[PDB]
Amino acid sequence: NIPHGQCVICLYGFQEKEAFTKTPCYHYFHCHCLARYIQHMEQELKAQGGVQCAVCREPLVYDLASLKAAPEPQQPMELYQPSAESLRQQEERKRLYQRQQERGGIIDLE
Amino acid sequence: ALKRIHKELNDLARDPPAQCSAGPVGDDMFHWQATIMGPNDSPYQGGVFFLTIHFPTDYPFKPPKVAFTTRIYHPNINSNGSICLDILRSQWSPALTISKVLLSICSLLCDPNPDDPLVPEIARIYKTDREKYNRIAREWTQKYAM
Ligand SMILES: O=C([O-])C(=O)[O-]
Ligand SMILES: [Zn+2]
Ligand SMILES: [Zn+2]
């Protein structure tokens, strides 16, 4: 069947027709998402001198090539539409920032 | 990175960590401004603190760069606003989110780590004379963040 939760790498859920996988530590990721994470970690570890689960740090077993072969999920981008209330809150923050500047309370870094 | 950043933005817009906010600087989805209200269990109570967040190209696999813009007296935060916090360096993971990072910084304000300081004089005072330390931290909060 299809899991009801979310992939923590991309923040989207799962749909039939999508390619996804489950780890031995019971965590679900899209195959595409997990492949990107593993590639990055292998690079970092080498520069230091054993890739761990993003969620729980258990060492993973995997075949990177098999994960890479899966199709990337088609996921429409989530439009950003600030509510009326959030716009009001933004205005108040602007007033507070202006006072901090006047006090010499804002770090410049020239 | 962009689809991930849009997902996060919408989730912080509808359910932000208590007393925090975050969103884009103008039109640039990769540069955000955040605010933290000073925790009530800290000498920063009453202050509003601004922070800058810059997302790297390879987000969420590399950490965001987070710094204080508002001046603050703390053993782990220096005069450039740099923050000594493990999850922003050695302990980053893509399971973390900007929402979780703000929560962690709130915790650090309540409870400093003076054995790994960015400011040795402030660490010394925190360890040998806590009364003097909270007095000075309150003094800076009142002058700069209120
Ligand atoms: O920190 C300062 O410079 C002060 O308290 O005047
Ligand atoms: Zn995913
Ligand atoms: Zn796991």
A92 domain residue, yes or no = no
A48 domain residue, yes or no = yes
A82 domain residue, yes or no = no
- The residue behind tokens 């933005």 is B9
The alpha helices in A1-110, defined as continuous H runs, are: 31-48, 64-69, 84-102
Domain boundaries, chain B: 1-146
SS3 at position B61: coil
Residue A21 lies in domain: 1-77
Between CA A16 and CA A23, with CA A22 as vertex, the angle to 5 degrees is 170
Domain covering B1-146: architecture: Roll (3.10)
Q: Do B71 and A8 touch (CB under 8 A)?
A: no
List chain A residues with CB under 8 Å of B67: 107
Q: Which two tokens stand for residue B122?
A: 């402030």
- Residue to mutate among B44, B66, B69, B73, with most A CBs inside 10 A, is B69
A22 domain residue, yes or no = yes
Measured distance CA(B7)–CA(B104) in Å, rounded = 20
As for how many domains chain A has, the answer is 1
- The CATH number of residue A53's host domain is 3.30.40.10
* Structure-determination technique: X-ray
A89 domain residue, yes or no = no
